[PDB]
Amino acid sequence: CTTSKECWSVCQRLHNTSKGWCDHRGCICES
Q: Residue 19's closest CA among 2, 10, 3?
A: 10
Q: Residue 2's closest CA among 29, 27, 25?
A: 27
C-alpha span between 24 and 31 (Å, rounded): 20
CA torsion sign for 27, 2, 8, 15 is: negative
For the chain, domain boundaries: 1-31
Q: Are 7 and 29 in contact (CB under 8 A)?
A: yes
In one-letter notation, the amino acid at residue 11 is C
State the structure-solving technique.
Answer: NMR
Q: Are 29 and 13 in contact (CB under 8 A)?
A: no
C-alpha span between 2 and 21 (Å, rounded): 10
DSSP 1-31: --SGGGSSSSSTTTSS-----EEBTEE----
Question: How close are the terminal C-alpha atoms of the chain, in Å?
Answer: 19
